[PDB]
Design a protein around this ligand. Structure first.
Ligand SMILES: [Mg+2]
Ligand SMILES: [Mg+2]
Ligand SMILES: [Mg+2]
Ligand SMILES: [Mg+2]
Ligand SMILES: [Mg+2]
Ligand SMILES: [Mg+2]
Ligand SMILES: [Mg+2]
Ligand SMILES: [Mg+2]
Ligand SMILES: [Mg+2]
Ligand SMILES: [Mg+2]
Ligand SMILES: [Mg+2]
Ligand SMILES: [Mg+2]
Ligand SMILES: [Mg+2]
Ligand SMILES: [Mg+2]
Ligand SMILES: [Mg+2]
Ligand SMILES: [Mg+2]
Ligand SMILES: [Mg+2]
Ligand SMILES: [Mg+2]
Ligand SMILES: [Mg+2]
Ligand SMILES: [Mg+2]
Ligand SMILES: [Mg+2]
Ligand SMILES: [Mg+2]
Ligand SMILES: [Mg+2]
Ligand SMILES: [Mg+2]
Ligand SMILES: [Mg+2]
Ligand SMILES: [Mg+2]
Ligand SMILES: [Mg+2]
Ligand SMILES: [Mg+2]
Ligand SMILES: [Mg+2]
Ligand SMILES: [Mg+2]
Ligand SMILES: [Mg+2]
Ligand SMILES: [Mg+2]
Ligand SMILES: [Mg+2]
Ligand SMILES: [Mg+2]
Ligand SMILES: [Mg+2]
Ligand SMILES: [Mg+2]
Ligand SMILES: [Mg+2]
Ligand SMILES: [Mg+2]
Ligand SMILES: [Mg+2]
Ligand SMILES: [Mg+2]
Ligand SMILES: [Mg+2]
Ligand SMILES: [Mg+2]
Ligand SMILES: [Mg+2]
Ligand SMILES: [Mg+2]
Ligand SMILES: [Mg+2]
Ligand SMILES: [Mg+2]
Ligand SMILES: [Mg+2]
Ligand SMILES: [Mg+2]
Ligand SMILES: [Mg+2]
Ligand SMILES: [Mg+2]
Ligand SMILES: [Mg+2]
Ligand SMILES: [Mg+2]
Ligand SMILES: [Mg+2]
Ligand SMILES: [Mg+2]
Ligand SMILES: [Mg+2]
Ligand SMILES: [Mg+2]
Ligand SMILES: [Mg+2]
Ligand SMILES: [Mg+2]
Ligand SMILES: [Mg+2]
Ligand SMILES: [Mg+2]
Ligand SMILES: [Mg+2]
Ligand SMILES: [Mg+2]
Ligand SMILES: [Mg+2]
Ligand SMILES: [Mg+2]
Ligand SMILES: [Mg+2]
Ligand SMILES: [Mg+2]
Ligand SMILES: [Mg+2]
Ligand SMILES: [Mg+2]
Ligand SMILES: [Mg+2]
Ligand SMILES: [Mg+2]
Ligand SMILES: [Mg+2]
Ligand SMILES: [Mg+2]
Ligand SMILES: [Mg+2]
Ligand SMILES: [Mg+2]
Ligand SMILES: [Mg+2]
Ligand SMILES: [Mg+2]
Ligand SMILES: [Mg+2]
Ligand SMILES: [Mg+2]
Ligand SMILES: [Mg+2]
Ligand SMILES: [Mg+2]
Ligand SMILES: [Mg+2]
Ligand SMILES: [Mg+2]
Ligand SMILES: [Mg+2]
Ligand SMILES: [Mg+2]
Ligand SMILES: [Mg+2]
Ligand SMILES: [Mg+2]
Ligand SMILES: [Mg+2]
Ligand SMILES: [Mg+2]
Ligand SMILES: [Mg+2]
Ligand SMILES: [Mg+2]
Ligand SMILES: [Mg+2]
Lengths: 80, 57, 111, 175, 138
RNA sequence: GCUGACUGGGGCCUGUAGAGCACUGAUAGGGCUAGGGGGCCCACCAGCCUACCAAACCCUGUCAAACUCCGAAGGGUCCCAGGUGGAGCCUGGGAGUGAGGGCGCGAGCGAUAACGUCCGCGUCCGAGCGCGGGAACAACCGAGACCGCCAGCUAAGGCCCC
RNA sequence: UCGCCUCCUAAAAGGUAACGGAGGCGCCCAAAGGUCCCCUCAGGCGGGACGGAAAUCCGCCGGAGAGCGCAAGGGUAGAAG
RNA sequence: UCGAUCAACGGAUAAAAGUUACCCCGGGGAUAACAGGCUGAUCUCCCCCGAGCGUCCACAGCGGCGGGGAGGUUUGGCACCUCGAUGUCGGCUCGUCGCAUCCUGGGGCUGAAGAAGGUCCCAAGGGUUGGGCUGUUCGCCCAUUAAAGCGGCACGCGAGCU
RNA sequence: AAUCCCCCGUGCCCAUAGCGGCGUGGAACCACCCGUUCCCAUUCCGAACACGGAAGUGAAACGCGCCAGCGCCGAUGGUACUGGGCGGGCGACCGCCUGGGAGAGUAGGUCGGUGCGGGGGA
């Protein structure tokens, strides 16, 4: 309807974002980024799960890469 | 060399990190003079609280 | 029309290959010749080379191709290289490009 | 007809102070130079009411050189609407774009006294070699009738130099 | 009256009156301006009050520019208390140093005595201005 | 058992303030122009004039929580240092609390009302109705009361008399 | 009005209230799924029988405004279409 | 692997609607109705501007559209003391104060000949009737009058009455 | 063999590499080109993809230059805003200190740069 109130909803926050930043040490499996579209693409030693979710493939440290119109990139550098 | 930091004004009513700071200079009561090295970390806290304690070299 | 069919399928197959992260056995083929170049990316660097040009052979372009494959294996295997992935570029795996690849086993392989 | 002001230099000396001081921060530049300068506000004002990015201002300043500037920016701060700072462009001989005022000459010249006059531009932007700078532009066009839009090159083009265009736009009309 | 057609959203949050006019402010169309010394929500009905005072002031003659527009919807409840928002019931946000109004094609002594009337219809203090070098070229 | 708040350096994350108009929308003045509002000459396709309608388009000029070509200060997190503190982490025993309030800043609701209401970050009262200033006054300024002193220096605020 | 999703509020990490502002879900698809191979939009202008603002065809221009089963967001043609 | 609008969607039972002015207990000023308080949208009264009407027009008398305030008498907002009780409308009795003045006194202007009015200024000393109707306050009406004023005091006043 | 230059691949920076105009290149690379027997093709078409070729052409495409009309990049100075510290205003809001500091815009910039490998000249 109009007045009484037709509004009132909202959904739960999804706690989305970057979970490991540059030069943080990770282990195989650690998810690195939680995100909706392809907003960061998977890099070197980095997986992407069906919900667009990026994880470390290998132990290591995380480096961020901005490739211009190729988008932004997350890799894991071994010395695992 | 080293700085002489003395508490001249009460921290009552200033944000908690401003109080946390005087613990890093380990200043507790008022008037308290303290003598510590001039290095950038010890200088950071001294600056943060500069509206309370007065400094000298 | 921007960015042609050629350059799309071009990128398409490279990108897929480039993920698995092997050494890349890339294949250019002109209407006259057929060349093949084994690359390591992340160093952006070529390792082994083979051409119908620098080998100066001719007649039956396919048969010429099988040769520049064996030519590559032989030179390549000599540096330790055994496993790689076949780039196949913007070319149907068929004919001349097929032939160089099936001439590139006997030597480093899985094609 | 011809204008000069003064100018001084500065390095430190926070703008707020200078501005309290009756003076007026600004900068001097061109392809070969960029330099920090100030002027007197009350002095500058008298000149600029006249010159107004239309005529050339020759500065002065110490050394004493005398520098052939065009004023290419004035930031007035919006609350008090009064200049907070000034851009002084120094000329050398290479063509440079700029704004020439416009002399509308005639009577309404057809439909006289009259339709409505409607001047759509008091200026035009034109590329000009500094040496010859056409201090105004007589535009008559006694054709001057109801409804038309004169474009650009239908202007006199005082001898020196060409438009910074666009060749097709709206200068005036009557209705 | 003055009002948009077509809005994306019917109601919209109040927000602040913080700052200086941020554009508008330099006297672009006319010989004389009326400039805002204070912030305020100026109402479609105050604007039209001022516009008419001026045309009435000269001859049906002259030319008038306005140049602020009431695109911000202004809600009010009835004498109720609290359940939802709404309703109804338009303003233009106006910070200091903005040119509203701004006449042309009239004698200075006309424009100025009309702009004086005009600002008597406004919730804020105002300033009459003329035109300048300072209003540049563009 | 040195890892703590806080702080220095370095990296990465972000889309607010401000601003902008490239998107989505709104939007003032002018120009040029589709369709026509049909003045009409038709009442054959025609068909021209528009101080009315008008897309887009150009020029000037603006506005936006659910617009963004841009975008600070700050904020988060990790590394390396300082930092021995009624600091920190681990296991376990005992709780109480789950009516908060004022004020400052940033928002929403409200009427650019409320000693209004609802969140955010701080603070103080709560529990500092102990002390000094503000005439008097929880929360504004000053300041964290272990005991004693017929000694000194100051804070805020004050220095004509009370 | 009550659970779930999208946006804003939300003060550039996460999180964050109100009988604050706006919308959606309670399904669907044996192909709308897996893989290999190929292909690239919408729009505009010009040309073309029946064809009209639009059916199909041909040319040029068109980096994505289209599409991605449905709301919104993010994403996306170097594909997710 | 199936049976859930267990949708009040962390889902009391397999199984459930109303009424109480005939009501009761435990609590709450955590929460409504009265009054006060904050607020002042609404209300009453000023003031700015000044299109315009007024033959003409200095606004004699009016005053559109808009703007700024004052007062705290209305209707409300809020929910702050009071629910281990602050008795509620109206009348009667008894007043007292405010002044935004109903009359009387003194003024200016007038579209004031006189008389009589209009409007605004000063002024709170005193005065400000009796009746029909209705619980009424208000209001209407009759007959008079110098006039038949508007408010505040817990909509003054129930340990004073009704 | 290094060095340089041209071509061909193929990376990288991610428009200062872009659009448009102009000019230039076929020996060699490359392309278009000759054909459709064969492998393989077209919801029709050897257009595309594919093969077997080598007569011609640098027209298209591609490469290399040069033009600043567009596009893209873009200071310095000054403001806005602001961490932290203080004031002022009934309010809306405003100012000072210290530290950080845009966006628009102005001056300019730009018709790319570069790694590995080949082929050819040096
Ligand atoms: Mg959400
Ligand atoms: Mg204090
Ligand atoms: Mg902190
Ligand atoms: Mg602007
Ligand atoms: Mg209002
Ligand atoms: Mg209620
Ligand atoms: Mg005013
Ligand atoms: Mg330590
Ligand atoms: Mg950091
Ligand atoms: Mg903003
Ligand atoms: Mg826009
Ligand atoms: Mg915004
Ligand atoms: Mg930038
Ligand atoms: Mg340490
Ligand atoms: Mg503890
Ligand atoms: Mg415990
Ligand atoms: Mg509870
Ligand atoms: Mg609670
Ligand atoms: Mg609370
Ligand atoms: Mg303040
Ligand atoms: Mg409260
Ligand atoms: Mg409040
Ligand atoms: Mg609090
Ligand atoms: Mg308590
Ligand atoms: Mg405490
Ligand atoms: Mg007390
Ligand atoms: Mg006290
Ligand atoms: Mg006292
Ligand atoms: Mg006291
Ligand atoms: Mg106290
Ligand atoms: Mg103590
Ligand atoms: Mg005193
Ligand atoms: Mg958004
Ligand atoms: Mg957030
Ligand atoms: Mg935040
Ligand atoms: Mg956040
Ligand atoms: Mg619904
Ligand atoms: Mg099309
Ligand atoms: Mg067509
Ligand atoms: Mg899309
Ligand atoms: Mg969507
Ligand atoms: Mg969608
Ligand atoms: Mg989307
Ligand atoms: Mg339930
Ligand atoms: Mg529940
Ligand atoms: Mg839940
Ligand atoms: Mg059950
Ligand atoms: Mg019962
Ligand atoms: Mg009963
Ligand atoms: Mg009984
Ligand atoms: Mg009973
Ligand atoms: Mg009881
Ligand atoms: Mg009472
Ligand atoms: Mg009450
Ligand atoms: Mg009381
Ligand atoms: Mg009031
Ligand atoms: Mg009041
Ligand atoms: Mg008044
Ligand atoms: Mg009340
Ligand atoms: Mg209460
Ligand atoms: Mg409360
Ligand atoms: Mg009670
Ligand atoms: Mg009692
Ligand atoms: Mg009384
Ligand atoms: Mg009086
Ligand atoms: Mg009298
Ligand atoms: Mg009298
Ligand atoms: Mg009189
Ligand atoms: Mg008389
Ligand atoms: Mg009296
Ligand atoms: Mg009386
Ligand atoms: Mg009787
Ligand atoms: Mg009776
Ligand atoms: Mg009645
Ligand atoms: Mg009576
Ligand atoms: Mg009452
Ligand atoms: Mg009473
Ligand atoms: Mg009684
Ligand atoms: Mg009593
Ligand atoms: Mg009593
Ligand atoms: Mg770009
Ligand atoms: Mg040739
Ligand atoms: Mg030749
Ligand atoms: Mg050519
Ligand atoms: Mg720029
Ligand atoms: Mg700068
Ligand atoms: Mg500050
Ligand atoms: Mg900049
Ligand atoms: Mg270029
Ligand atoms: Mg290269
Ligand atoms: Mg070479």
């Amino acid at each position: 309807a109009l007045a009484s109130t037709r509004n009132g909803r909202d959904s739960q926050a999804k706690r989305l974002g970057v979970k490991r930043y540059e030069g943080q040490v990770v282990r195989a499996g650690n998810i690195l980024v939680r995100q909706r579209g392809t907003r960061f693409k998977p890099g070197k030693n980095v997986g992407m799960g069906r919900d667009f979710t990026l994880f470390a493939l290998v132990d290591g440290v995380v480096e961020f890469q901005d490739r211009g119109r190729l988008g932004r990139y997350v890799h894991v550098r071994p010395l695992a | 060399p080293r700085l002489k930091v003395k508490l001249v004004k009460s921290p009552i009513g200033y944000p908690k990190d401003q109080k946390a700071a005087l613990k890093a200079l380990g200043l507790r009561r008022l008037q308290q003079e303290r003598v510590l090295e001039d290095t950038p970390a010890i200088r950071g806290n001294v600056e943060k609280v500069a509206h309370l304690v007065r400094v000298e070299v | 029309a921007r960015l042609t069919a050629y350059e799309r399928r071009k990128f398409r197959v490279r990108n897929r290959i480039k993920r698995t992260g092997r050494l890349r056995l890339s294949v250019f083929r002109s209407l006259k010749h057929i060349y093949a170049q084994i690359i390591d990316d992340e160093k952006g660097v070529t390792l082994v080379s083979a051409s119908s040009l620098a080998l100066k052979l001719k007649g039956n372009k396919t048969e010429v191709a099988r040769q520049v494959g064996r030519a590559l294996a032989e030179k390549a295997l000599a540096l330790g290289i055994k496993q790689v992935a076949f780039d196949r570029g913007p070319y149907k795996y068929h004919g001349r490009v097929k032939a160089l690849a099936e001439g590139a086993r006997e030597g480093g392989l899985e094609f | 007809m011809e204008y000069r002001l003064k100018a001084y230099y500065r390095e430190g000396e926070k703008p707020s102070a200078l501005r309290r001081a009756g003076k007026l921060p600004g900068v001097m530049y061109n392809r070969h130079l960029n330099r920090k300068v100030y002027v007197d506000l009350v002095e500058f004002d008298k000149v600029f009411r006249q010159a107004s990015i239309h005529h050339v201002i020759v500065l002065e300043l110490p050394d004493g050189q005398s520098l052939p500037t065009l004023v290419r920016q004035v930031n007035l701060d919006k609350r008090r609407r009064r200049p907070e700072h000034v851009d002084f462009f120094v000329l050398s001989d290479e063509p440079v774009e700029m704004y020439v005022p416009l002399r509308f000459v005639g009577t309404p010249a057809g439909v006289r006294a009259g339709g409505v006059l409607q001047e759509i531009h008091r200026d035009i932007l034109v590329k000009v070699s500094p040496r010859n700078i056409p201090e105004f532009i007589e535009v008559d066009v006694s054709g001057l009738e109801i409804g038309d839009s004169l474009h650009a090159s239908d202007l006199k083009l005082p001898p020196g130099v060409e438009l910074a265009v666009s060749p097709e736009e709206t200068i005036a009309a009557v209705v | 009256m003055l009002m948009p057609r077509r809005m994306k959203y019917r109601k919209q949050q109040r927000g602040r009156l913080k700052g200086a006019t941020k554009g508008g402010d330099y006297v672009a169309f006319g010989d004389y301006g009326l400039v805002a010394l204070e912030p305020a929500w100026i109402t479609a009905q105050q604007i039209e009050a001022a516009r008419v005072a001026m045309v009435r002031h000269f001859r049906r003659g002259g030319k008038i520019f306005i140049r602020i527009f009431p695109d911000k919807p202004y809600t009010k409840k009835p004498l109720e208390v609290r359940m939802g928002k709404g309703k109804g019931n338009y303003v233009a946000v106006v910070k200091p140093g903005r040119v509203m109004f701004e006449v042309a094609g009239v004698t200075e002594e006309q424009a100025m005595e009309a702009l004086r009337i005009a600002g008597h219809k406004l919730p804020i203090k105002t300033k009459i201005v003329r035109r300048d070098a300072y209003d540049e070229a563009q």
